[PDB]
Amino acid sequence: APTKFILPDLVSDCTYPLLLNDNCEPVARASEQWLIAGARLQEPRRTKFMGLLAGELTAACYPHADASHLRVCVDFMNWLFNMDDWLDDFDVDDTWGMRHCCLGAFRDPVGFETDKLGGLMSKSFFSRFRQDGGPGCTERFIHTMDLFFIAVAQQAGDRANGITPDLESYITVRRDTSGCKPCFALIEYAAGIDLPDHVIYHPTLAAMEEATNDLVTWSNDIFSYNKEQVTDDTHNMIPVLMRERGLDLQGAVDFVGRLCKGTIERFETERARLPSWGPELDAQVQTYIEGLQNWIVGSLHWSFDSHRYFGKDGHAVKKHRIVKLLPKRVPQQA
Amino acid sequence: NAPTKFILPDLVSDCTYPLLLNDNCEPVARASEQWLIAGARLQEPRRTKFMGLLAGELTAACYPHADASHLRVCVDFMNWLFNMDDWLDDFDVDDTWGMRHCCLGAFRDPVGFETDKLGGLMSKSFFSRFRQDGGPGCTERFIHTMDLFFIAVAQQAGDRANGITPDLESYITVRRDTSGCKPCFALIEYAAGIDLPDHVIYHPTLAAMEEATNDLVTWSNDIFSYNKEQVTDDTHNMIPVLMRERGLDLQGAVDFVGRLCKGTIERFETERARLPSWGPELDAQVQTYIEGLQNWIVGSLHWSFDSHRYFGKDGHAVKKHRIVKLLPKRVPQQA
Ligand SMILES: [Mg+2]
Ligand SMILES: [Mg+2]
Ligand SMILES: [Mg+2]
Ligand SMILES: [Mg+2]
Ligand SMILES: [Mg+2]
Ligand SMILES: [Mg+2]
């Protein structure tokens, strides 16, 4: 039975420039207070939340957003991390109820009545989104949030059933529980563009999005395996692989690490394949894929600034790459 | 040397689902043909080809319990879909997006949408009648999966323009949307007078039964329609995809898709056996929906040999002897 594992080196390979929005510090602090208020955070969660640093993630992923747009992005990211953590303790029925409240607020903030914190916060940041977002990325945001909730209901069912999914079913569902897709809609929003359907749904752009989704998500599976195995959460490629393929822990970890390198190569390979829709649209496409690039480098690095995955030891673990497994809530041999 | 023929896997002689036929089939079938001919302005030779399609008969087998008015909306859609598919075989990517814009505009506003395009005028005709009784859930599933269909066919059209045979993994993903099975499934709800709630119909076991049904209907179509599609070297078909990716010969790829077809019917039964319960009212609506999926499997398999679309006048002979004589290519392969 293993007590630790070695992190694949994903950061030293990546040569994209790491940027940080000039508006980062005041917006991050303000959004921290918006979340504590909106989720009614109390200890212990409140202190854990102050080491999340989603505002600093968001500032690295949308480094050119103006202050108004950045704050909508950060509020969403704080809301998303809070929503994720809440839903880790929801059953299937209550997941659908939360889906109903939040999508109701996104689609009809004026007419949708609700007194739930999830939906109240949803109206707050999304009614600020709606002041500027184009109709295309508005609907991509709502539709991919819908996909998020549907997939997390499937995760909640697997958890209640004590199931570990098979690999090809996991990958399919995980692309939606990650939440990367609505973050992509925020790229458009925060850059002040609204890509046409025939551009955004072209297979090469769709493939670059997926490549980015997989990079962020499968690397998150590596970085977050430690906090997730505490409660034997199997919505993570590592236990999925271990069960399906008989891999031990480091074997599974290394297999996922290879997948991560391979998806950045996929991203660059499709980047070369991009067609041209003339100068104005080509320039908006470049802006969008730079946002996908910023998600790649930004998230990889932020995972070690946050307290969420490595506690206080983030910068230290970035250097020596050894992860000591946390104690399980219930011992494996209980 | 290159093959002139291949052998059809036996897909029908083991399928044990009862084959049903709507009581209203014959008069609805004939009225819809006239609707389509007028709406698409069909002329010869296409008009005579269309009189051998028999999409009304297919539709009456897939929705055998619909009343006459709901059946007629389904048959109009089916005639419109086959017509649209054939038109789009000769559209470029730009014009495909243009058709998509017209038809989705029509679906979303089936009385007020201003258009003079035949594709959209017909969309307004059948979908205005659809919305007279379709629930909000299946209405949006129809529209959104028609959206997915157009997006996917635009990808097909780009592949065709580029001379590209896709890889198998990418092909299967896109093909679940170019088939148009997903909007057919929304019509199961409409035609049964039900409107399943989000938490039921997007439950993973129903979504899996839908995909298993999609895959049966679609991959079996790749087999039946390979002959007509290869005439123009159309590679949006798992058979040329398999030959290119895995070096199989024709019979080997055909046999491979055959095994897949048996495996997806098995998947449907396996998921069927672990359906959850939402109580008696919802459970009855789920059983009604699942029987619709069932009727699509058995109906489409038998219909493919009644139609002239795939085997011309020889479907019943081919169903029994299973030898497919390859049609002449438009341009010979060694040209
Ligand atoms: Mg989660
Ligand atoms: Mg989580
Ligand atoms: Mg995680
Ligand atoms: Mg087609
Ligand atoms: Mg076709
Ligand atoms: Mg076909």
Residue numbers in the entry:
A (entry chain B): 15 to 348
B (entry chain A): 14 to 348
What did the study's authors say about this model?
Furthermore, class I TPSs share a WxxxxxRY sequence motif that facilitates the closure of the active site via salt bridge formation upon substrate binding.
The obtained structure thus represents the closed, catalytically active Copu9 (Copu9·Mg3·AHD) conformation. While TPSs generally are helical bundle proteins lacking any β-strands, two short β-strands are present in Copu9, one at the N- and one at the C-terminal ends. These two β-strands (T17-L21 and R335-L339) form an antiparallel β-sheet, which might further stabilize the closed conformation. Copu9 shows the classical 99DDWLD103 (located on α-helix C) and 235NSE243 (located on the opposing α-helix H) motifs.
